[PDB]
Amino acid sequence: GKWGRVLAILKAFEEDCATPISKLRQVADAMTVEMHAGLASDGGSKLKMLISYVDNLPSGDEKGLFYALDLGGTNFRVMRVLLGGKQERVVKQEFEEVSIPPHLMTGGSDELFNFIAEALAKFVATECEFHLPEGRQRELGFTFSFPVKQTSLSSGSLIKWTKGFSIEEAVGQDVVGALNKALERVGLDMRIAALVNDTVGTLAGGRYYNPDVVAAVILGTGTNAAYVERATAIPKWHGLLPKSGEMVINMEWGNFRSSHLPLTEFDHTLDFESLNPGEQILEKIISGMYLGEILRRVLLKMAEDAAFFGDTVPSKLRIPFIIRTPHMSAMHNDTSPDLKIVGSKIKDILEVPTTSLKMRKVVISLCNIIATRGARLSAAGIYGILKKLGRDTTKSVIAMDGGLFEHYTQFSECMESSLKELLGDEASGSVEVTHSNDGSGIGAALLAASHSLYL
């Protein structure tokens, strides 16, 4: 007993994480129930099911030059897209990444937005060619990726700063109006056509290219989903209907929880030690931020209780979030017979001098267990969305983005194949998953196009 203790921990973990199809169906059903709940009243579910205030999704027929501003950290992005209609679609796109000087992260509101407006104007001046205007005012999609309370298509109030920003007067104020002011003060004739959420932007980008897009899911460091709901099937919404009766809903599905989620001691402790205990339960088991942290916690127990790394626990293994997402992807992707890549990553991250094949086999097994659970629960969530739309029986396209979907190949394959099993042979044929890149950039510019005054 010792490495038998390692195998005991691994076996119970594998069992406790299991997601047989019957359980996935119950997770999916619970998702659909929670979606109804969140739409029934504000605060109806742990799923916020927010009205996104989109009036019109892009169709692909849009023509002209459109801009986007992606502000979600100390690095922001300005970009433009040239749209040419159905056939050509996106002709050209250009962008510039700009860094916010650390002093403007904590100063006044006016100074931050003046700076952003100025970068935008210099960027606009780099247009080639009549690249722009039928005498047209330029139009901008604005992605503001800080906690925000969107109140209309073109307004939203900052709730709380993150990422080392601390401009206290900006709290509770309208970010679009703030940017507008700076755009006025700068000499740039530019209208803000839409305040954009990045997940909604991912949906918009997908729909632009594919009329059968009904939902968007982001599986990266964080997670979220948005989908197109029947405007008349939302009891909590009393506002004017959008053009096609299509109401884009921002689910905020990271906060989903259910008895049907197969949790372990490691998930419970992770949650117990988090800044938001009892919240974001689904995010804590499916998102990139957390998969590596779950792996770390199981390994730490094996190290403390079963001498996994010898008679001394590696001190680096005790550092929360030291094992990250592409570390995990890399080890899982390892096909060498001696598991070189598993050993290499463990060596680098935990600063241990040696590992055996047996240890490496356990590590890659744990990667597989954790990724598979995350991927299968993600599939269940998507299936829940398809059921809400009555598209679990029968094209329905899911626009996807995020590092997990894009680069962690085993995760993506497991998710799509599990979704296929949930759907079954008859109905799965009508379901597709497409990559919709840059929801916060091009996605936002496409929402500017679909809310243009020159439509």
**Same-domain status, 263 and 143:** no
**Same-domain status, 331 and 216:** yes
**Same-domain status, 134 and 91:** yes
Tokens of residue 306, six digits: 């079963």
- Data resolution in angstroms: 1.8
**Same-domain status, 178 and 270:** no
**Same-domain status, 289 and 346:** yes
Q: How many Cα atoms sit within 13 Å of 349 on the Cβ side?
A: 26
Tokens of residue 246, six digits: 């299509």
**Same-domain status, 301 and 318:** yes
Q: Indicate the number of domains in the chain.
A: 2
Tokens of residue 7, six digits: 């195998």
- Neighbour-count burial for 305-342, b at 16+ CB within 10 Å, e otherwise: ebebbeeebbeebeeeeebbbebbbbbbbbeeeebebb
| Residue 224 assigned to a binding site | yes
| Residue 403 assigned to a binding site | yes
| Residue 126 assigned to a binding site | no
| Residue 283 assigned to a binding site | yes
* Domain encompassing residue 273: 1-51+209-437
In the 3-class helix/strand/coil scheme, how is 242-300 assigned residue by residue? CCCCEEEEECCHHHCCCCCCCCCHHHHHHHHCCCCCCCCCCHHHHCHHHHHHHHHHHHH
> How would you classify the pairing of strands 138-144 and 190-196?
parallel
CA separation for the pair 161, 150 (Å, rounded): 15
**Same-domain status, 425 and 348:** yes
| Residue 63 assigned to a binding site | no
| Residue 335 assigned to a binding site | no
**Same-domain status, 259 and 147:** no
Catalytic residues: 77, 145, 198
Asked whether residue 61 is domain-assigned, the answer is: yes
**Same-domain status, 266 and 396:** yes
| Residue 198 assigned to a binding site | yes
**Same-domain status, 382 and 271:** yes
Rounded to 10°, the helix 357-388/3-17 angle is: 10
**Same-domain status, 269 and 148:** no
| Residue 56 assigned to a binding site | no
Asked whether residue 455 is domain-assigned, the answer is: no
**What is the domain-level CATH number for residue 200?**
3.30.420.40
**Same-domain status, 166 and 238:** no
Tokens of residue 31, six digits: 């998702």
**What is the domain-level CATH number for residue 250?**
3.40.367.20
Show me where the chain is broken: residue before each gap, C-N > 2.5 A.
129, 394
Q: In one letter, which amino acid is 310?
A: G
* Other Cβ atoms within 10 Å of 288 Cβ, number: 25
3-state class (DSSP) for residue 166? coil
Q: What's CA 428's distance to the chain center, in Å?
A: 24
Spatial contact of 287 and 256, defined as CB atoms under 8 Å apart: no
CA separation for the pair 375, 366 (Å, rounded): 14
> How would you classify the pairing of strands 213-219 and 190-196?
unpaired
3-state class (DSSP) for residue 169? helix
Residue from 369, 328, 315, 429 nearest 16 by CA? 369
CA distances from 428 to 391, 409, 413 (A): 10, 20, 15
Sign of CA dihedral 318, 324, 330, 334: positive
